[PDB]
Design an enzyme around this catalytic site. Sequence first.
Site, PDB file in Angstrom:
ATOM      1  CD  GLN A 146      -2.899  -0.312   2.639  1.00 17.07           C
ATOM      2  OE1 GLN A 146      -2.288  -0.510   3.696  1.00 17.07           O
ATOM      3  NE2 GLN A 146      -4.180   0.070   2.608  1.00 17.07           N
ATOM      4  CG  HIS A 149      -4.304   0.571  -1.787  1.00 16.53           C
ATOM      5  ND1 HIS A 149      -4.710   1.848  -1.475  1.00 16.53           N
ATOM      6  CD2 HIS A 149      -5.285  -0.252  -1.341  1.00 16.53           C
ATOM      7  CE1 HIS A 149      -5.887   1.802  -0.876  1.00 16.53           C
ATOM      8  NE2 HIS A 149      -6.254   0.539  -0.776  1.00 16.53           N
ATOM      9  CG  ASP A 205      -9.222   0.313  -2.882  1.00 23.46           C
ATOM     10  OD1 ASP A 205     -10.311   0.622  -3.423  1.00 23.46           O
ATOM     11  OD2 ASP A 205      -9.155  -0.222  -1.758  1.00 23.46           O
ATOM     12  CD  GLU A 229      -9.377  -3.473  -2.660  1.00 23.11           C
ATOM     13  OE1 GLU A 229      -8.185  -3.841  -2.725  1.00 23.11           O
ATOM     14  OE2 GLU A 229      -9.925  -3.059  -1.613  1.00 23.11           O
ATOM     15  CG  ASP A 249     -12.775  -3.300   0.185  1.00 27.67           C
ATOM     16  OD1 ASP A 249     -13.429  -3.665   1.172  1.00 27.67           O
ATOM     17  OD2 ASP A 249     -11.889  -2.417   0.260  1.00 27.67           O
ATOM     18  CD  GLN A 286      -9.464  -5.762   1.501  1.00 26.69           C
ATOM     19  OE1 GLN A 286      -9.237  -5.314   2.622  1.00 26.69           O
ATOM     20  NE2 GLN A 286      -9.725  -4.983   0.462  1.00 26.69           N
ATOM     21  CE  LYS A 296     -13.570  -5.819   3.167  1.00 24.65           C
ATOM     22  NZ  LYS A 296     -14.807  -5.015   3.246  1.00 24.65           N
ATOM     23  CB  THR A 320      -5.642  -2.812   9.186  1.00 30.18           C
ATOM     24  OG1 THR A 320      -5.579  -1.402   9.432  1.00 30.18           O
ATOM     25  CG2 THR A 320      -5.344  -3.545  10.493  1.00 30.18           C
ATOM     26  CB  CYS A 321      -1.817   0.841   7.723  1.00 31.29           C
ATOM     27  SG  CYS A 321      -3.305   1.808   8.082  1.00 31.29           S
TER      28      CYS A 321
HETATM   29 MG   LIG Z   1     -10.591  -1.352  -0.790  1.00 29.01          MG
END
Ligand SMILES: [Mg+2]
EC number: 4.3.1.2
Lengths: 415, 415
Positions: free
Chosen positions: B172, B194, B238, B273, B307, B329, B331, B360-361
């Site tokens: 990302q 991303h 995305d 995405e 997503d 995705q 998640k 996740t970041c």
């Molecule tokens: Mg997304």
Amino acid sequence: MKIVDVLCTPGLTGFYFDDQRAIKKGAGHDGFTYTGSTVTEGFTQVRQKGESISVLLVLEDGQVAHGDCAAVAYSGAGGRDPLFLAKDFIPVIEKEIAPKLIGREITNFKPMAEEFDKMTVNGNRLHTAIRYGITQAILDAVAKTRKVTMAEVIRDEYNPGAEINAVPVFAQSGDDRYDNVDKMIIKEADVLPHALINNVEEKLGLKGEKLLEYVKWLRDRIIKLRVREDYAPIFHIDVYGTIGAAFDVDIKAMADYIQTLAEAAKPFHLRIEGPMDVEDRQKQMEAMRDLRAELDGRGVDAELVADEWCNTVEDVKFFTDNKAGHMVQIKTPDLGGVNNIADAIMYCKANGMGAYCGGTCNETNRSAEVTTNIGMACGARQVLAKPGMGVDEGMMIVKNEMNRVLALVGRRKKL
Amino acid sequence: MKIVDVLCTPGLTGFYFDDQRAIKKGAGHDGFTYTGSTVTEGFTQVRQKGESISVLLVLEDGQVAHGDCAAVAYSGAGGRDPLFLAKDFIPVIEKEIAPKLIGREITNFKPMAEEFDKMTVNGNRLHTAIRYGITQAILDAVAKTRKVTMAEVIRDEYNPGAEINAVPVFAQSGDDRYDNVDKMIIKEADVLPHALINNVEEKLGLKGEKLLEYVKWLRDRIIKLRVREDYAPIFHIDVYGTIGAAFDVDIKAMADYIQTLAEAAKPFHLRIEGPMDVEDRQKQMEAMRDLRAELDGRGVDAELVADEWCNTVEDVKFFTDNKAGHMVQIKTPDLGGVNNIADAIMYCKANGMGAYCGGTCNETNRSAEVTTNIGMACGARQVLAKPGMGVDEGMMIVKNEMNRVLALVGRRKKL
Ligand SMILES: [Mg+2]
Ligand SMILES: [Cl-]
Ligand SMILES: [Mg+2]
């Protein structure tokens, strides 16, 4: 517990291998990359991926000890071992080191670490980065054998009887000295931001006027952004010898300047890393010793942190002995075997020298966990949040490890 | 083997808790912070430190299993569990789950994770982050009891007889969609960038012209900077429904516009995405399905990644059953028990839907290692490099874990 196998995998680090010789000659910018010809042997580009080697020790009981070989970003630069390309250095570990470990009964960390830190192949010492990884692996192997934290192993063998407590976490900002300050305040760094004041004109000011305004911005930023009123971190700013250059290494003129930095920093406490950077180790020591003595004789409440010309464990003893600053930087990857970090830290303690247990942005998450443990066990004055320049990640790796280690140790006291 | 003790520590993460509601309300940027009133319950500033809870299971042999509770950066946002503050949730673990884990026999991962995933308190399901952290810890406990990798445990229980291979690593960029691209090329990301194309006028362009141009730039950038000519990463952008909005969700128009990106990305393969983002899950599945139909029928080899509206395991099953996109995705933080990641991937692979093992970041170095293992075990199409926005650090954590796990499996294959 015997070691039964040794595996090596190449890997990434939290940053880059940078050709310093190329950058200092005038390498241009292009996005996040440098441009022009490479100067340093081994480099294919001025900026390329930083590399590690994960060293795995499979233990007799089936546990796996883990340390990472890493070097600084300026790998293969002046006075360093060759560019640490995993491809060049995996074959050494696999053919010269692995057979020395397979079937070894695990003894104490100190002797085994020292054996592997000094070991020669063809009469020649091992690359610092390899010593770094192999000894981290050995520490982790001792810790797993004894069913305690690496901190606890280091404490037992280097700091008998002492408590293991949290160590202040220092974060580095690089050139983004404003946005990453926000990060550090929000993540509550105990010490910040480094600020990468590596330019007299651009960053310090010819009169130090820019850094002066930065210190005031920094103080105000904290007051403004902090969630808790009692959060009061310590300022640690690295001036790459520019205070010296801006003031012709005049002891008194530097101290007067530094005093105004301190006035500007209050209520917060000020550490200046590398005030000057002179032409040999002897004269760096002297300039640090005397600037400290100046600051101290006048009661200016600022500390000096050593860096330039203070590299080896011998250097650490030399700056320590001569009180060449208030804090000596312990340069984790450069010292090779991680046993040397503990030695160096414990010398500082025994002689009342503040010990900064450092590192590089170009090492790994694992190497960071290991040296944090060493820092904790020896009661370093601060440890570096590392690797990477993202700040958040480096803080997370280091502080979460610190937290868990204190949890486990505290469990062990009440058993 | 039983768990003998449970320890919880508060921790950091690779990112921040952001009040998404306030950000949509118009919170102004100030440095790395956001100004003005919070809108979401529990938030005290619009951006606050990401929080984790490290969960440690001490086993009777003295090994320590480690899992990390973590939530997305938009913790507490719409359709989400309350803001995951450590201080709010550690006592929940300590009071309600620790007694259930202390004394518990390690059997297999699958039933243990399901029990703790579905576990209730005063009739209510547990926070997804706690479930996330607890099941990680369980998985690691199982691996450490069996003296095998976490990947091998998951492979054994969810993917019997499969080999465990490397998995493409996806990075990302966030908004810094230029310099972070450079990073990814230097670190050799398998999938990128991303690009956070989350705005119609500023980012996609009204007639798509900006994304088209960015695609062209991205393609040239890779050809420009790659160290070796045969590095051919996969494009993954995305677009946050914006292709839908700019083209009135007209299937033909969207199919036409992605064809042009596809043409502009050649030689590089393209994944888009969230092409659209409509009113409900049913209409979302239909738009995804019909858009994929058009592209497939027209032989444009560009993929659609689901997503929005595809959240739970039943949703992944729903999008799989109706071929709504080429990839889905998974998640990881949102799914609670990490056993659900294995179930979702394996469903996708039983029915020829690409499985994107996300994250996740705002999770941790440890959660990323664990879910990376799950991804490898079930043979995901890709895994997210994580946590953090630094890129370097998330690639190192994920990819260095990947390489070590493969080294260990390969060893076990030759034993
Ligand atoms: Mg997304
Ligand atoms: Cl900045
Ligand atoms: Mg310095």
